[PDB]
Amino acid sequence: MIEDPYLGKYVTCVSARSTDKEILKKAQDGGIATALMVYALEEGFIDGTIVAGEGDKPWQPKPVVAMTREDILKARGTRYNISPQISWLKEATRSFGLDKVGVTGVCCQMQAVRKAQLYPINMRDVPGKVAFTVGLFCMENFSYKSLQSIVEDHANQSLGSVKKMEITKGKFWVYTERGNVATVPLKATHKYEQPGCHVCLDYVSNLADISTGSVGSPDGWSTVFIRTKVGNEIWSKAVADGMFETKPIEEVKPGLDLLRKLAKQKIDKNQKTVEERKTFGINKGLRNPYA
Amino acid sequence: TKVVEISPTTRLEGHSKLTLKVNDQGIVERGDWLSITPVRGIEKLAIGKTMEQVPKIASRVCGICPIAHTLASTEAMEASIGCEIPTDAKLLRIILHAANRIHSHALHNILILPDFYIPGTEKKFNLFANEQPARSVMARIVRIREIAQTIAAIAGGEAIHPSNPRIGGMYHNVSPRAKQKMADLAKECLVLVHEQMEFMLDVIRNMQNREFVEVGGKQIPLPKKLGYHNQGVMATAPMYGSSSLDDNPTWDFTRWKETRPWDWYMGEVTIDLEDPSYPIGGTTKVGTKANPQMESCTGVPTYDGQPVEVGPRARLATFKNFDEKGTFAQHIARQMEYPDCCYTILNCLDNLNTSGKVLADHIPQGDGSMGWAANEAPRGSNIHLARVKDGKVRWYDMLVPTTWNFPTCSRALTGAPWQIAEMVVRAYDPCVSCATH
Amino acid sequence: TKVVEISPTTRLEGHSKLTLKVNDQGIVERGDWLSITPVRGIEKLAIGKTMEQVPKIASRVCGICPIAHTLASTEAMEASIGCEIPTDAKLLRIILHAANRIHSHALHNILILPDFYIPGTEKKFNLFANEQPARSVMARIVRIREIAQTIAAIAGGEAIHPSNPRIGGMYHNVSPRAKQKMADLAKECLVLVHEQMEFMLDVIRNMQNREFVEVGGKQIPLPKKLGYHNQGVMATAPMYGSSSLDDNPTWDFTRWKETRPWDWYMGEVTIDLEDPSYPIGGTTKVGTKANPQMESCTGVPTYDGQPVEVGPRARLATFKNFDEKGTFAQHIARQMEYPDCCYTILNCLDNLNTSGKVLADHIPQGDGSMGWAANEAPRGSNIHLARVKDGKVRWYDMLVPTTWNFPTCSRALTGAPWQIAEMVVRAYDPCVSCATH
Amino acid sequence: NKIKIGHVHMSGCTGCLVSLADNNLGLIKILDDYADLVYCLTLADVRHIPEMDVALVEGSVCLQDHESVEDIKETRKKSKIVVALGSCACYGNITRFSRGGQHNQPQHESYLPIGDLIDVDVYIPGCPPSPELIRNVAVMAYLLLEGNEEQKELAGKYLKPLMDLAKRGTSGCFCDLMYDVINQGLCMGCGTCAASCPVHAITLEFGKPQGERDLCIKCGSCYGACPRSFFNLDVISEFENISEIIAKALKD
Numbered sequence A: 001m002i003e004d005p006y007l008g009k010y011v012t013c014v015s016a017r018s019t020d021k022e023i024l025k026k027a028q029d030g031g032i033a034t035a036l037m038v039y040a041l042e043e044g045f046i047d048g049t050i051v052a053g054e055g056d057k058p059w060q061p062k063p064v065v066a067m068t069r070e071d072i073l074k075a076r077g078t079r080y081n082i083s084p085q086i087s088w089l090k091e092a093t094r095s096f097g098l099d100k101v102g103v104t105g106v107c108c109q110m111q112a113v114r115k116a117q118l119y120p121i122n123m124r125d126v127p128g129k130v131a132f133t134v135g136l137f138c139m140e141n142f143s144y145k146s147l148q149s150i151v152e153d154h155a156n157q158s159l160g161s162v163k164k165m166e167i168t169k170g171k172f173w174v175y176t177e178r179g180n181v182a183t184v185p186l187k188a189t190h191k192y193e194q195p196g197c198h199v200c201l202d203y204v205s206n207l208a209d210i211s212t213g214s215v216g217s218p219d220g221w222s223t224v225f226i227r228t229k230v231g232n233e234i235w236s237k238a239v240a241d242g243m244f245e246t247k248p249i250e251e252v253k254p255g256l257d258l259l260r261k262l263a264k265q266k267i268d269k270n271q272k273t274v275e276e277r278k279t280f281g282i283n284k285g286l287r288n289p290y291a
Numbered sequence B, C: 001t002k003v004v005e006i007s008p009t010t011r012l013e014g015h016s017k018l019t020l021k022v023n024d025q026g027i028v029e030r031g032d033w034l035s036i037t038p039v040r041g042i043e044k045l046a047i048g049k050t051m052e053q054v055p056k057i058a059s060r061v062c063g064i065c066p067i068a069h070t071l072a073s074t075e076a077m078e079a080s081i082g083c084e085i086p087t088d089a090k091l092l093r094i095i096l097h098a099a100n101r102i103h104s105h106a107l108h109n110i111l112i113l114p115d116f117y118i119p120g121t122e123k124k125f126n127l128f129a130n131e132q133p134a135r136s137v138m139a140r141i142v143r144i145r146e147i148a149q150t151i152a153a154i155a156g157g158e159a160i161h162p163s164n165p166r167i168g169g170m171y172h173n174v175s176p177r178a179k180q181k182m183a184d185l186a187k188e189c190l191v192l193v194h195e196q197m198e199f200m201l202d203v204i205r206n207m208q209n210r211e212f213v214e215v216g217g218k219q220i221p222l223p224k225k226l227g228y229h230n231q232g233v234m235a236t237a238p239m240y241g242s243s244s245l246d247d248n249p250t251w252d253f254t255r256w257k258e259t260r261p262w263d264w265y266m267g268e269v270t271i272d273l274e275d276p277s278y279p280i281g282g283t284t285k286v287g288t289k290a291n292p293q294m295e296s297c298t299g300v301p302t303y304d305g306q307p308v309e310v311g312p313r314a315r316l317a318t319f320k321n322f323d324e325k326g327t328f329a330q331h332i333a334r335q336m337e338y339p340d341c342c343y344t345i346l347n348c349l350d351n352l353n354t355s356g357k358v359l360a361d362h363i364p365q366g367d368g369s370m371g372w373a374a375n376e377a378p379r380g381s382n383i384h385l386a387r388v389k390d391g392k393v394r395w396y397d398m399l400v401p402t403t404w405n406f407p408t409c410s411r412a413l414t415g416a417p418w419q420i421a422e423m424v425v426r427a428y429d430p431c432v433s434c435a436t437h
Numbered sequence D: 001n002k003i004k005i006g007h008v009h010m011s012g013c014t015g016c017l018v019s020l021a022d023n024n025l026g027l028i029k030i031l032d033d034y035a036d037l038v039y040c041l042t043l044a045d046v047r048h049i050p051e052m053d054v055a056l057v058e059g060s061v062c063l064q065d066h067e068s069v070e071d072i073k074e075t076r077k078k079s080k081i082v083v084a085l086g087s088c089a090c091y092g093n094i095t096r097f098s099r100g101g102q103h104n105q106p107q108h109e110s111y112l113p114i115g116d117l118i119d120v121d122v123y124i125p126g127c128p129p130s131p132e133l134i135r136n137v138a139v140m141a142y143l144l145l146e147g148n149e150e151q152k153e154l155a156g157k158y159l160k161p162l163m164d165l166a167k168r169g170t171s172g173c174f175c176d177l178m179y180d181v182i183n184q185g186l187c188m189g190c191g192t193c194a195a196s197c198p199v200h201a202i203t204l205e206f207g208k209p210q211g212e213r214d215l216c217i218k219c220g221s222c223y224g225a226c227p228r229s230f231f232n233l234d235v236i237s238e239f240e241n242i243s244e245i246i247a248k249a250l251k252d
Ligand SMILES: Cc1cc2nc3c(=O)[nH]c(=O)nc-3n(C[C@H](O)[C@H](O)[C@H](O)COP(=O)(O)OP(=O)(O)OC[C@H]3O[C@@H](n4cnc5c(N)ncnc54)[C@H](O)[C@@H]3O)c2cc1C
Pocket: A026, A027, A028, A029, A030, A031, A032, A033, A034, A035, A050, A051, A052, A053, A061, A075, A076, A077, A078, A079, A080, A081, A082, A083, A085, A104, A105, A106, A136, A137, A138, A139, A140, A141, A142, A212, A213, A214, A215, A222
């Protein structure tokens, strides 16, 4: 175990990408989140998983319980607006009849799952049926109207043409299907962030079985934390089964040094906000969920 | 009274001249702007031809606005035979229409800017010259028109003389890729036309604050009411048009009548005032006889018994009660039409089903009933009227925007220094091949 | 060019500011008037709620014009589900609507008179002060608004946030006594509004003959074309409104599109011109950064791709071809609307059957179809659009008059001395809580 | 000596100000004799919040709007008596339902009544608030600050229940009638709640309140008006005398 104060508790950290070439075609990064859920399904570690499927408007995610490789793959790619993944967490154990639920999502959604496992409040059967969680790194998120405003105005792109979006190197990047690229400085995007993200003290999905993201690894590759016993069993067996290319993270640029720094900026900035809440008013303050 | 004549006019489409009676100060008392473009006679040669051919011939009336004649002619045939085209065909036609309006208004920027001043200076725009700001402006205009023609080619089959329109809808729907491409281009175009529009409005506003302009070395005073006329306006839509298939058509054929130039133009005059220094090549020689009634090549359509103004200003006055008139008001209203074109294209692409039908399942052959269609061409209401029987055109008539504007502009010439009569003319964005057909 | 900023504006409803680029004489070159009122987000919070609740929430967008949102929202729901309300419900709604227009126009008299002069003098109206003529004028205005609110309470259940409107008509018809009371009050009100109207028109006419006004001790010249813009106007009725249930609706949703402030507002600027003597408290400090594109709290609805003016002048221009424009023309047109309100109330009472039904026998639950309703609020066209399915709002959109007027007023600021930009603004009778919702 | 009164407009609809103005010549009487309006963006050109004896504050506070948060803090600093005017200021009202996501400020998501950010001395609940209540509070505030001891005693007794409401909390709903009246063994079926509800969300079934919770806009009126919320017998039993006193103070 490593007990990093900004990267959470983990056993190891590698740089990885799926060896499944079909998965990689539309994966955001290394295809880790898709590849792990597909593999867990084929191996019987899960019988279904909650993923950010395609929704009713372009680039709007819709949470869905996926129970086939095909349905899991439909959720490839980052949607930078809210996907209420946990809304299907109980239902997966009811009408879907699952015994071994997988869950994908960002840090706060990983938090929601663990709170439900330990303090189930009208969440019967959920603590014992969560089987496998994969958490994405997340700096901040946006409402759908925010995402529309950023892509359509600031990047000047039609949503119906966008093939990929990416926040990296200080910019919001928009890639179109016909091959064009547009960028927006992140300074322009700040007004649009979901306000509840400003109180979030978790960057690399500390509470997931396995955590995965982009920062620290080259393009096409993911930085992966293997954290829990569940996480280590599944990762070991998938590596052994040929499912991933890996590199120790210390042999990779920018690697864990850049990552630990961005994690620190996130927590530091948000801890400050958390603190300003206490004296937000005159002789009174706002609620602190962490108190 | 003296008579001065400018022949030919320039920086407009096609071939016309100005035959002007002026007072002792050189101010127009009564001026006639008239077509002297040969009459190719599209209305008469159409008789007996197939309803499929006639719109493709009518297209070749004009290569700046062939969309206008292609659509107005096709939809006149559809109105005569009672053919209702599919939704996705209509959406593709509107995309074609809006794109062509962009390219046309931007081409007209090229023609009128040489008369205009770099704001706050005494320098006029020379768009040929590889200097700033002209070259940066030319680059924007050129990209705008390129985008416009590209969209027109994709949705209409061809930018000049679109091939996709046919009786009953379109030959082709577009691919998912093509739909993305048109959207990508419209997004780029919208930013550019917003920039060009603000640029042009500033240039125009500078013109309205000037007191004189320089023509051929001389200072020419700028009247405050330059280009004012009392004919009012006519328009059938802010964007697309109307046809006799509509539940409530927005054009009234009982209010229309067309005369010869006879009723509205001057008879024989003799030129007794000549200026060899008029740039570049002078005016008509003293002693030349002119006869606008006999030399005008157009008919004169009227509405409620009088000439009317058509075009962008007519549209904004009819549909938003735009309340400025004359030369610079016409220029302003034209620029204001830039963004609607891109928003319309984007909305139409959004609703377009690329798997949808584009050709009516049944195309009737007609029984000789009259139908009509109005297309709001970039220069104004383009109204085609037809009787189709057994698939053949038995009767055809074309009331084209510049045809309408010829007698109206003429009356608007009163009060102008004859040396800027051409500026009054160019605010109408004339298409004399259109006007004459 | 320098940048001066007035924040906040005053003597209008709600919270906005003026970010102004001015020439070396202090004349606005390009000004942005923008909402900085927080977005309560009524359109998004409506989704999933019941069609009965949403109009009562929308009412609370604004307490000067809650009738506008109550009626436009209710009638949008009725249009989506296909519910035809009974005649006597419609008559009671029109009485409610007309009464509220009286109270609103009279409240606006209170806000604008401090900028105006007692005719033929250099004294401005101070309506607080217990002196003449101000106190006599205040007494008339106060009685006018009292009558108006009383009628509104009787026909609408409540003067502010009327309670009687419901999906399908009204909760209550009124008693024979109530009908007599409303008539008695309208008779009294008609005499008073005729007096107030003639008083206001005289004050305005005196303003049009002035050459300067005094702001903060200094003489500020009054441009002849103060507040002129080239956006034209939009209006759906002279009195009540229109909805997609009508045989011939008088608003065209295919001509509407809403953008972010992005397309129409200035980006980042820095304030480099400050006047601490601007009454009372000065202007924004030098060095302050502003960004209208990002700070504006509204969307920008457009008609034919351009901002439009809505409101009384828009109504008289659309329906009577009223042909004056700008600041004092807007003030005039608003006053001219006083008598129609009382004549309408009296005619509606005359036709009202106090034993008549006020609730449709059947209220459908909707299938997700889109409906829309336009209410001609005191400040202009208030258009609500909705999809109701199974009694719940699945989609909701609000295009409110001051939302429309924000970009249009902005453009109208050109040419004004920045010290009277607020006078241009107040002729629009702005409701910034309305505009933002 | 006239007291100094401001109207502060937070995230409100201005209907609270309209309600004040709907006292008609009563308002002008108060402005003539008892009070100077030192601040009100809707009616006067004072651009910044000055010192006030009484701040009538309408609307709630958007947490994501910096100027708004500064305004409500500045208001408490500048004012002797802070009045939450109307249900948005008291209880959040329709802004409880705000949840962001709308142009052009999709982050404008969170709204709280003013009592969650500053200390509030007096509630005037209602949506819309009744003109008569706003008038009574203005008159009594004056008497509390410029009267003889007999007046300042009356004023303090009159305002006490409105001050108690401010100390009770910042929430208003149909449920108040359940939680604090019916569930407390206090409801006696008078039906007053039903008359006060501005949206007709309350009916009485066999003499007992029935709330259409998805119609209720959370204004807190019904509990306020209920005669088993507060019933201060010392004041209300003297209704004839207190009415005559208020009338005389408005007389010409
Ligand atoms: C708001 C958001 C912010 C992020 N910020 C960062 C960051 O700052 N640094 C960094 O390194 N990585 C960040 N990521 C993660 C990164 O963008 C990729 O999502 C991650 O690397 C997974 O890529 P992959 O190839 O392994 O997954 P893929 O194989 O492409 O599969 C996509 C996975 O992402 C899930 N998913 C996609 N969109 C959402 C969504 N809105 N909400 C919940 N789950 C979703 C899907 O269920 C699926 O599990 C962010 C992701 C999101 C949604």
